[PDB]
Structure 1
Amino acid sequence: GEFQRKLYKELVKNYNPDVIPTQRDRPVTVYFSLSLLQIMDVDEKNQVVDVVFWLQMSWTDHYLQWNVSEYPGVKQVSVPISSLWVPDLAAYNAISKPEVLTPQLALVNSSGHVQYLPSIRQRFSCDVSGVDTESGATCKLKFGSWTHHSRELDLQMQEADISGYIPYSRFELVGVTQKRSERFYECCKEPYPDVTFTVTFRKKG
């Protein structure tokens, strides 16, 4: 429709995707979830794990809301992420650039709530020593904002999800636990929240 086209036009007007959408007194709450899909490979020589996982990120961008009466049918839109602000979450212990497997698009409803849900393949540093033992190996996948502290970006975990782990992998996914931490570095005065997903796994047999 032309309404959806006017709306797309207006969402981008006077909008800078480099500007985190805070409102004074308020940090941007970003809800964050990682679903492990497949353990692609263990490098026992170089201490590396290769994983495929589904990230779920959502937050409210209040510069992106619209009155639905002015845009009758339009209740959500699908938008390329280059055109809006997205959390600068970094994989603290990645040793490779992420390979995004899915279309780089976000959903946005009329309250300005954004949902961005990439599927990603990425290699991480990990001690994979015990992978062929009963206890298994344990990898920490650690994520957090690279440039935004707690009072700018409040990173929130959502519940752990192993439901997506492929059942025919040569690795048995023993468990996944998660932890949110606020670290002080002393670059900065402010703490930076990070979310850590702890994956325990072992060779089947």
Structure 2
Amino acid sequence: GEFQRKLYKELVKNYNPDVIPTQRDRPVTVYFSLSLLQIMDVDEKNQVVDVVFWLQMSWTDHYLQWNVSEYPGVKQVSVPISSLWVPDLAAYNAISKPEVLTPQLALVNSSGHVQYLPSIRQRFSCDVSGVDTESGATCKLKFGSWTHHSRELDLQMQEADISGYIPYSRFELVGVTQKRSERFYECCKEPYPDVTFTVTFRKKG
């Protein structure tokens, strides 16, 4: 509609997608969770697990807000992530580049809340030696901001979800636990937060 056009113009001026949208003191809080969809493969020789999953990232970008009074009907807009600042979350123990399976777009409402919900295929380092046993094998999928510490970027866990796991896989999904951690490094002076998704699974039969 004619109003979305008007809005793109206003929101786009001065906007810089390379600059994390902090405000005086307040870090950007980034809510994060992972839903396991499928375990594509297990490589018992090179110790790697190949998985497809869905990620929810949401946060508030205060530069991306508007009064609905000035833009009737416009409650939300779809925005290519290349035009937005987005959390630089990385899988700390990945051994392959993430392959994003879905359109690289984010939903953004009038409050400047942003939802990026990408589906991803990625391989990880893991001891899968236990996959053929009753105890199964346990893989940690550990994520955190690559370059923003806790006081710029405040990573928080959202309630996880296992309802998405495909029933006909050859791998039974035993469980998925979720943990938020925070540590300093001898390197930098600020602490860094991470979220680890611990997945346990075994071969059916």
Q: TM-score range by the shorter chain?
A: over 0.9
* CA shift for structure 1 position 45: 0.1
Between the aligned partners of 2:52 and 2:190, the Cα distance in structure 1 is 32
Cα deviation, 1:107-126, whole Å, max 9, x if unaligned, reads 00000000000000000000
CA shift, 1:51, in A, is 0.1
Q: CA-to-partner distance for each residue in 1:149-177, whole Å, 9 max, x for gaps?
A: 00000100011211000000000000000
Cα distance per residue 1:63-115 (max 9 Å; x no partner): 00001111111000000000010000010000000000000000000000000
- Per-residue deviation, 1:182: 0.5
Partner of 2:33: 33
How far is the alpha carbon of 1:186 from its aligned partner? Answer: 1.8
Find the residue that maps to 1:156 and give its secondary structure.
Answer: strand
Task: For residues 30-87 of structure 1, give each alpha carbon's deviation from its aligned partner in whole angstroms, at most 9, with x where no partner exists.
Answer: 0001000000000000000000000000000000000111111100000000001000
Give the distance between the partners of 1:92 and 1:11, measured in 2 at CA: 33
Matches of 2:145 and 2:17 in 1, distance apart? Answer: 16
- Tell me the alpha carbon deviations over residues 170-192 of structure 1, each in whole angstroms, 9 at most, x when there is no partner: 00000000111112112111110
Give distance in 2, aligned partners of 1:184 and 1:40.
35
Alpha-carbon distance between aligned partners in 1 of 2:160 and 2:73, rounded to the nearest angstrom: 35
CA distance in 2: counterparts of 1:102 and 1:185, whole angstroms:
35
- Distance across 2 between alignment mates of 1:159 and 1:67: 31
Q: 1:69 maps to which residue? A: 69
Aligned residue pair count: 205
The residue aligned with 2:194 is 194
Percent of pairs with identical residues: 100
Equivalent residue, structure 2, for 1:158: 158
Moved more, 37-46 or 182-191: 182-191
Q: Distance in 2 between matches of 1:161 and 1:31?
A: 14
Q: Give runs of ≥4 in structure 1 deviating > 4 Å.
A: none
Q: Secondary structure at the match of 1:4?
A: helix
- Computed over aligned residues only, the root mean square deviation of the Cα atoms, in angstroms, reads 0.6
Gaps of 5+ in 1: none
Q: Which deviates more, 184-193 or 141-150?
A: 184-193
Whole-angstrom CA distance in 2 between matches of 1:186 and 1:15? 35
Tell me, in whole angstroms, the C-alpha distance in 1 between the residues paired with 2:106 and 2:32.
15
1:1-205 matches, within 5 Å, as 1-205=1-205
Which ranges in structure 2 are unaligned for 5 or more consecutive residues?
none
SS in 2 for 1:131: helix
Q: What are the superposed Cα offsets for residues 127-151 of structure 1, whole Å, 9 maximum, x if unpaired?
A: 0010000000000000000110000
| TM-score using structure 1 length | 0.99
